[PDB]
Design a protein around this ligand. Structure first.
Ligand SMILES: Cc1cc2nc3c(=O)[nH]c(=O)nc-3n(C[C@H](O)[C@H](O)[C@H](O)COP(=O)(O)O)c2cc1C
Ligand code: SF4
Ligand code: FES
Lengths: 429, 213, 87
């Protein structure tokens, strides 16, 4: 294969993405959910982990780590502590709204994924951490969980397999940092959402100090279908090491902003015009695209022409797939103001635990505010670049990196705009 | 917003607060979700329940949550001041929360914010003198493809225009509650002007199941 | 927290009277050794120097911080009291 991105409906996983069919148990079963769940559970964790591995699935939460290998850290003899699966539904990355649709329109896929993924890990229960703003979405998930409990699909003797499994829903209280896996765990434990240093890794010491795996909603929700249809089916989509289908969010300056499922490695231009109805004002009006949520560096129009949407392709473009949330900016956008607002976002979300982000991100925010008005000198651009490199790789968690990268992207591709603004301000003062 | 507490007549340790008997039943179910020996895990949900009953959190509410769960009061103050959804001072009946991050900013969230300020006659961060509405800005609310949008209490209102947000305020001001969701014509997150995928009937149980299962 | 000043051995002498100068209130002294501090690489060097100079001396053994057992993971213990309530 050389071309990707004409996914057929029969190959789509989230078939109620738009909520046009009954999201409840009766509709979910009619669409293939919960089918032969007992057989999957009886195959054993090694078979389930084997399927997840051969599918080439990678983390859909933004970091893209191989799921099969990650989940295998939990396949070990019990040492007396309970084992837990924590499903990350915090969905805080600006531009990203995919996990919201799964939770409210395909909740039973997430619940079944919790049971199947939990079985492979040997977990006794799944804690679903959903952000507190998603109140109606959380209630839908709770309604679905009650339906599954009453049909015996979860709880004692889940699906008749003799495996006891509970699914808990825990709501956040308004913190983007609580999407970070260790901050999420600390939040579940009743503390501030401040990340943990590693080691220990969560698979050894996690929620309540117990072996734990944190998985994104989308990563979990697809696992039952990978088991039913097989890893080879999943691995037949997208490039090698970039397998499967993916939920994309196309927001910003597009004619029809939308969420859609498409194959991995589809061209970015193909995605924006086939599904979102093209760029506002046409493709020639495109200025820049943030390809994977606010934490991934922007790329200009030239790069957008032929870049594919997968982990490897976007890395070579000096960015990343991230959450696959595409934010589109046309030529009428104040690009400096757009990025400054993201830095302001990271300033408001930093937990404040560690020095480079507590002080550095707030510092970068102040510099960006002056850059928007042009009230600076060109020498400060290289200073700002150097400051961002002192944050990246020196913080406890990746929020520090996620604040540096947007700044680096702007300087990389839009330095003359920054310098032009400075000239205007100096000319007028 | 300040992250230190100063006692006042309206908010001090002797300010009256207790959970209703029904809310004590809900607290018991919350605490049972966690392993024995780890009751501090219930601080966030129980603290939020105290806010759902009282509307906001007086220091006496924080002290009660600490007392019930047997955690030091300071550890509850830490949570209350860390998470933005906790209201540590009174808010209006309708807490309007306008997303102004870049995906929403690109689709003209400033016009929504100006429309609300003009209608209510208040600035961002203020409460109306009638104490019906409080207005603030917030970060991404996880509905970027439906920008611009606001959240009022528990409900999202999306795909907004200045006209649309004024009607919602007029309905809340008139005692009614408007329906949540997009106001542009579409139902949720599907592309406008017709679906581009999921146009065929979904397959049934057992479709594409691998052999040997 | 720096430990660089705890590397060498020292020799000081017994503290003697200081009084207030009547004119200014400055601290006066009659002890010519009041500021004498000597440095030595080892305890034996210091003791040898005191002995040949005829000074009666007291030696106090070097206090070394005991090696500790540290573990960041212990902050999140499942069943032990080492679990921290805040970060
Ligand atoms: C600031 C920050 C916010 C994050 N938010 C989320 C999130 O909302 N949802 C998510 O799945 N992962 C989020 N992550 C990534 C998680 O830490 C983690 O990598 C992921 O949940 C692992 O699950 P996965 O392997 O299925 O992707 C965030 C990371 C950081 C640093
Ligand atoms: S990088 Fe920022 S958010 Fe992450 S632990 Fe440090 S201060 Fe907290
Ligand atoms: S940027 Fe407003 S909902 Fe995401």
């Amino acid at each position: 294969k050389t071309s990707f991105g004409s996914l057929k409906d029969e190959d789509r996983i989230f078939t109620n993405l738009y909520g046009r069919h009954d999201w409840r148990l009766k509709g979910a079963q009619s669409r293939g959910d919960w089918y032969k769940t007992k057989e999957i559970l009886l195959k054993g964790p090694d078979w389930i982990l084997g399927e997840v591995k051969t599918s080439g699935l990678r983390g859909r939460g933004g970091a893209g780590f191989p799921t099969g290998l990650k989940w295998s850290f939990m396949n070990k003899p019990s040492d007396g502590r309970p084992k837990y699966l924590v499903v990350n539904a915090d969905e805080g990355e600006p531009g990203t709204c995919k996990d919201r649709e799964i939770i409210r329109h395909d909740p039973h896929k997430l619940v079944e994924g919790c049971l199947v993924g939990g079985r492979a890990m040997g977990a006794r229960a799944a804690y679903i951490y959903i952000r507190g703003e998603f109140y109606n979405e959380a209630s839908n998930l709770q309604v679905a969980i009650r339906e599954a409990y009453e049909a015996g699909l979860i709880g004692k003797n889940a699906c008749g397999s003799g495996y006891d499994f509970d699914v808990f829903v825990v709501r956040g209280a308004g913190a983007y940092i609580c999407g970070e896996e260790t901050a999420l765990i600390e939040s579940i434990e009743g503390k501030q959402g401040k990340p943990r240093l590693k080691p220990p890794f969560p698979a050894d010491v996690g929620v309540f100090g117990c072996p734990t795996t944190v998985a994104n909603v989308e990563t979990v929700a697809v696992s039952p279908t990978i088991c039913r249809r097989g890893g080879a089916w999943f691995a037949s989509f997208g490039r090698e090491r970039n397998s499967g289908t993916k939920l994309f969010n196309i927001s910003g300056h597009v004619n029809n902003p939308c969420t859609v499922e498409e194959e991995m490695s589809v061209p970015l231009k193909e995605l924006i015009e086939k599904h979102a109805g093209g760029v506002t004002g046409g493709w020639d009006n495109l200025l820049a695209v943030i390809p994977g949520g606010s934490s991934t560096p922007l790329i200009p129009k030239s790069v957008c022409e032929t870049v594919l949407m997968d982990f490897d392709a976007l890395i070579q473009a000096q960015t990343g797939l991230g959450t696959a949330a595409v934010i589109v900016m046309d030529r009428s956008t104040d690009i400096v103001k757009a990025i400054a607002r993201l830095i302001e976002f990271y300033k408001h979300e930093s937990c404040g635990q560690c020095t480079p982000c507590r002080e550095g991100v707030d510092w970068m925010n102040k510099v960006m505010a002056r850059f928007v008005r042009g009230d600076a000198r060109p020498a400060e651009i290289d200073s700002l670049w150097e400051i961002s490199k002192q944050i990246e790789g020196h913080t406890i968690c990746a929020l520090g990196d996620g604040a540096a990268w947007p700044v680096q992207g702007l300087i990389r591709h839009f330095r003359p705009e920054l310098e032009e603004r400075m000239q205007q301000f100096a000319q007028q003062h | 917003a300040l992250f230190v507490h100063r006692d006042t007549p309206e908010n001090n340790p002797e300010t009256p607060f207790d959970f209703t008997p029904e809310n004590y039943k809900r607290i018991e179910a919350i605490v049972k979700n966690y392993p024995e020996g780890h009751k501090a895990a219930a601080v966030l949900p129980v603290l939020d329940l105290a806010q759902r009953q009282n509307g906001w959190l007086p220091i006496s509410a924080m002290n009660k949550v600490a007392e019930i769960l047997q955690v030091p009061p300071m550890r509850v103050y830490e949570v209350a001041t860390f998470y933005t959804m906790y209201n540590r001072k009174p808010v209006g009946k309708y807490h309007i929360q306008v997303c102004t991050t870049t995906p929403c900013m690109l689709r003209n969230s400033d016009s929504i914010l100006e429309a609300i300020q003009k209608k209510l006659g208040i600035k961002v961060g203020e409460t109306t003198p009638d104490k019906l509405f409080t207005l603030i800005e917030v970060e991404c609310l996880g509905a970027c493809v439906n920008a611009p949008m606001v959240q009022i209490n528990d409900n999202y209102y999306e795909d907004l225009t200045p006209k649309d947000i004024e009607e919602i305020i007029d309905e809340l001001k008139a005692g009614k509650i408007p329906k949540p969701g997009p106001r542009s014509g579409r139902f949720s997150c599907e592309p406008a002007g017709g679906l581009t995928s999921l146009t065929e009937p979904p397959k049934g149980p057992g479709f594409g199941v691998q052999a040997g299962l | 927290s720096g430990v660089n000043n705890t590397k060498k051995w020292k020799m000081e002498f017994d503290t003697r009277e200081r009084w207030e100068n009547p004119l200014m209130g400055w601290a006066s002294t009659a002890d010519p050794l009041s500021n004498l501090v000597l440095t030595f690489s080892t305890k034996e060097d210091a003791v040898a120097f005191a002995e040949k100079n005829g000074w009666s001396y007291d030696v106090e053994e070097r206090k070394v911080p005991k090696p500790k057992s540290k573990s960041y993971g212990a902050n999140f213990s499942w069943n032990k009291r080492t679990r921290v309530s805040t970060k």
